[PDB]
Symmetry: T
Subunit: 106 residues, 12 copies
C-alpha cells in the first residue's frame, strides 16, 4: 500500500469503530489500522520530498506514527476487554494525532 491507501484504511476503520455496537467489530477495526500504520510510518509525504531523512521534520513525521500506534494499541487494550464505549472514546481521542500531523505535513 502507498501512503494514501493506508490513510484511507485508517479512516474507514475509524468510521467502522464509531458505527460499531460490539467489541469484536472494534477489535478487528483497530487491528487493520495497526497494520496500515505499520506499513505507513516509513513513507515520505510529498511535502517532505526535499528534506533530508535526518531532518527534524521527517523525524517528527515518524514520531507522529509512533504516537498514533501507541494509542491504537491503547484502544485495542480496551476492546480486548469488552469495553466498547471506552474503546470508541479512545479511538476518538486518536484524531488529535491525525489532525496535528495533517496541519503540519499534509
Amino acid at each position: 500500500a502507498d501512503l494514501e491507501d493506508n490513510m484511507h484504511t485508517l479512516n474507514d476503520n475509524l468510521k467502522v469503530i464509531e458505527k460499531a455496537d460490539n467489541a469484536t467489530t472494534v477489535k478487528d477495526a483497530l487491528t487493520k489500522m495497526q497494520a496500515a500504520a505499520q506499513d505507513a510510518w516509513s513513507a515520505t509525504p510529498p511535502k517532505l520530498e526535499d528534506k533530508s531523512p535526518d531532518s527534524p521534520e521527517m523525524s517528527d513525521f515518524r514520531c507522529g506514527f509512533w504516537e498514533l500506534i501507541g494509542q491504537i494499541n491503547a484502544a485495542l487494550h480496551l476492546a480486548k476487554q469488552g469495553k466498547v464505549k471506552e474503546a470508541q472514546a479512545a479511538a476518538e481521542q486518536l484524531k488529535t494525532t491525525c489532525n496535528a500531523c495533517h496541519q503540519k505535513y499534509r
Copy 2:
C-alpha cells in the same frame, strides 16, 4: 464486517488495482477482495430479507458471490505470475458480475 462494509472494501480495492504499477500491490488488493467476499456470501441483502433461505433469489444471490470469488481467484492467478496489466484487465472485467448482482438485488 457487515455486508456494506465488505462492499466498500471490494470497491476500494478495485480502485487500488486500476492505478497500481506492480503485481505486489495488485496481488494484495485481490487478496483483500477475497477476504471481503468470503465474509459477504452468507449475508442476506435487505431486499431479500423476507424471502425464504431456500428461495431461488437467495440461491441466486449466494451463487453470484461464488462467481465473483471465482474471477477474483482467476485475476489473482494472473497477478501471482507477474502479469500486472492482465490482472488489471481481469479486475476491470469484474464489474459486469458486480452490476449483474446489483441490478437484481442491490
Copy 3:
C-alpha cells in the same frame, strides 16, 4: 464421521445453542455444526445411492448443504460479536433448511 453421525451432531448443537446463556458456548456449538456440515456435504444419502453423481437430486442435495453452511456462518458472525440472543434466533431459523432437505431426501 458418517452422514448419520454428522446429522446427530447438527441436532445436538441446536439444543446446546438454545439452552446457552453466553456467547462462547454458542460460538463453539456453531463451530462444531460447521464441522459436521462440511464433512456431510459430500456424502450420499440412503435414498440417493441409486442415483448418478451428476443427477439433479445429488446436485440439489449438495446445494441444500451450501445453504446450511451459509446460514451457519451468518449465525457464527453474530455469536462472535457476543449477540447471544440474535445468534440463538438465527439458529432457530436454520431448521427451515433442515426441514426442506428432510422432506425431499430423508
Copy 4:
C-alpha cells in the same frame, strides 16, 4: 498451473489410484487432485472464451468442479479410513463428472 496442467494432474493421480494397493498412496493421490481442482475451477476454457462470466454455461462449468471436488472429498473420506477398494470405486465413479463436463465444454 494452467487449466491443461491441472487436468493432466487429475488424470495422472486417477491412474495412480487404480494402480494402488494401499490407502496412503490413494490418500496422497486424492490430495493432489484436490489441489488441482481448487486451482482450476476459476479457469476459463477455450470453448467459453466468448461467454460472459455470468452465463449459465460458465456457471455450469464452475458447478462441474464443485461436484468434482465433492466426490474427491468423499473418496478421501474412504481412504483416510483405510478402505482402499471402496476408495478406488469412489474414484472410478468420479469419471461421470469428468465425462459430462468434457462432452459439453471440452
Copy 5:
C-alpha cells in the same frame, strides 16, 4: 461445555465406537472422548456442591475421571495401531468405569 454436555459426548462416542468398521473412526471418537473427559474432570456434580473441594468425594470424583482418561488413552493406543476390535473391546470395558462413578455421585 457443562458436565452434562460432556457426558452426552462420552455416551455418543461409545455408540459410535461399537458400530465402527475401521480404526480411523474409533480413534476420532476416542479423541473426542478425551477432550470431553478433560473438560469435565474439574466440574462439580449437583450432588457434591454442598461440599468442600478437598473432601474425599470431590477427590474420588476427580479420581474416577483420571481412571477414565487412562482407559481412553489405552484404547486410543490400540486404535492408533489399527486394532479396531481390540480398541472396540477396550471401549466396551470402560463402561465399568462410567457405571462406578454413576452409582456413587449421580
Copy 6:
C-alpha cells in the same frame, strides 16, 4: 521459577482477579495461575525434604496441587464464558485450598 516464586505469582493474580472489571483480565490471571501451579506441583517444600517422595506427605502435597489446578480450571471455564462475577466468586473460593495446604506443609 522456584516454589516461592510461583506462590507469589498465585498471590498476585488472586489480588488482580478481585479488583478486575472484565472477563479478559480474569482469564489471563487464571491462565498465569495455571502456569504457576503447573511448575510448582513437582517441587519439594522445605518441610518435606527430609522425606521420601512416595511418602503420603509428598503424595498429599501433590494431591493439593491437583485440587488447586481443578478449581482454577473451573474458574477459567466461567471466565471464558464472560461470567466475571462468578469467576471472581470462584477465585475467592479457592482460597480455601491455598489455606488447607498451608497449615499442613508451610
Copy 7:
C-alpha cells in the same frame, strides 16, 4: 510403544544421564523419559490384568507413575537451569521410585 519398550527407554536414559558431561544432554534424556512415562502410565502390567481398573492396585500403579513424572519434572527443572550435577543427583534419586513400583507389581 508397549510398557516394556518404555521401561527400556527409562533405563537407557538413566544411564545416559549418569555419564553426561553437560546440561543439554541430560535435558534431552529427561525429555525422553517424560515422553516414556506419559505413554506408560495408562498401560496394564501383566500381574494386574486379572483386575478391575478401579482397584487400588491399578490406582497405586498409576499413582507411582505420577510420582515418577513429578521427579522427572523436578530434575528437568534443574537441568534447564544448567545444574548438571544437581540434575544428575536428582536422576539418581528417582531410582528409589522405579524400585518401589517394581517390588510391588513387577
Copy 8:
C-alpha cells in the same frame, strides 16, 4: 494488565534477577519484564490523564518507555549468552530509568 500491574511485574522480576543463580531464570525474568513494559508503553498515567495525547509530557512519558525496553533488550542479550552476573549488573542499572520516570510522572 493495567499500568499498575505492569509496574508491579517490572519490580517483581528485578528481585528475581537479583537473587538468581543461573542464566535461565534471568532470561525468563527479563522476558516477562519486556512483556510488561511493552503493554505499559501505551498506557496513560493518573497524573497525565488531564493532558493531550500529543502533549510534551505524554510524548516524554512514552519516550521514557522506549529507553527501558532498549536496556531490557541489552540485558537479555547478555543473559542469552549465559553471562548471569553481567546480566544482573545491567538490570541493576535499569533503576536509573525507573527513577527518572517516577520523579517526573508518578
Copy 9:
C-alpha cells in the same frame, strides 16, 4: 552479534544491493539489514558509555537507528514491488543516515 558485528552486516549488505540485478537478492539483503539494526539499537556505543541512559545523546543514538530502520523498510517496500533500481537508489541514500550517526558517535 555485538554492535560492530551488526555494523559489519549492514555494510556488507549495502554492497550486495548495489551490485545485484534482481529484487530477490535486494529484498533478502534488506531483510538482513533489518535484523542487524534490530539487534543494534539497544547497544551503547563506546564513546557514549559514561553518559546516562537518559542523556540526549543516548536518546539521539537510539533515535538514529529507528530513522535507519525506517528507510530500510521504505527500501524494502520498493523491492517487494519489483522496483529493483529504485530500491537500490534508496539503499544508496541510506548512507547519509549512516554518516550522520558516525560523525556524532562512531
Copy 10:
C-alpha cells in the same frame, strides 16, 4: 510415489517449464521436481535389485540423484530471482544428468 511415478513427475514438469512464460510457473514446477527426486533417491532400480546396497552402482545411483537435486536447486535459484529464460536454460541442461543415469541403469 514409486520410482516410475516420480520419474513421470520429473518428466511432466520438464515440459511445463519449457513452455512457461513466467517465473512463478517455473518455480512451482521446479519445487515439484525437488519433491519427486527426494522421494526417488532411496529407491532401488530394477536392474540393480540383485547388487548389494554397498555396491558402487548403488552408490553411483544415489550419487546421480544428488547431482540432479543440485541442478534443480540451481535452476530454482534462478527462478526465484525472476530469471525465467535462464531458469529454463538450466532445466533444458538437466537432461544430460537424466540421460547419463538412464544409459547406466534405466
Copy 11:
C-alpha cells in the same frame, strides 16, 4: 546424543521393528532410527580421531551413513503404506550396511 548412544538407538529399534505386529510401531521405530542416524552421520569414530576430515576413511565413513539413511527412508516408505512384513524384511536387510561399516571402522 553421542555416536555410541545413536548406535544403541539404531539397534534398539531393529528389535522393536522385528517384534512389531502393526505398521504404526514400525513407522515410529524407523523414524527414531532416522533421527539417530542423522545425528550420527557427522560424528568422528574413536578409530578415526587420528585422521583428517578430508581423509578417504572419513569420507567413506560419512558415505556409509548416506546409504543407511537411504535404506531407512525406503523402509519408512513401506511402513507408511501399512506393509508391515515388507517393512520388517527391508529393515532386516539394513544389517548389511551396519556390518560393512563395523568391519571397517568399529
Copy 12:
C-alpha cells in the same frame, strides 16, 4: 546469494566463532554458515564453467560442501551442549575442507 556472497558469510561467521566467549554467539554463527553452505552447494564455480555437471570435478565440488556441512553440524552439536572451546576447535578443523577445495577449484 551468489557463491561469493555465501563464501563471505562463512568466512565472517568463522571469525565471529574465534572471537566468541559464549556458546550462543557460536551456535548462531554456525547456523548462519549452515544456511550459506546449503545455498551454495548447487552453485557452479567459474573454474568449472566448462565441465559437464556429471564430471568428477563438479561432483567432487559437491562432495566438498557435504563434508563441510557435516563438520558444521558437528560444531553445532558441541555448541548446543555449551562446549565453547571444543566448538571453536571443531570450527578451526573446518578450514582443512575450506583450503582443500580452494586449492583445486578456487
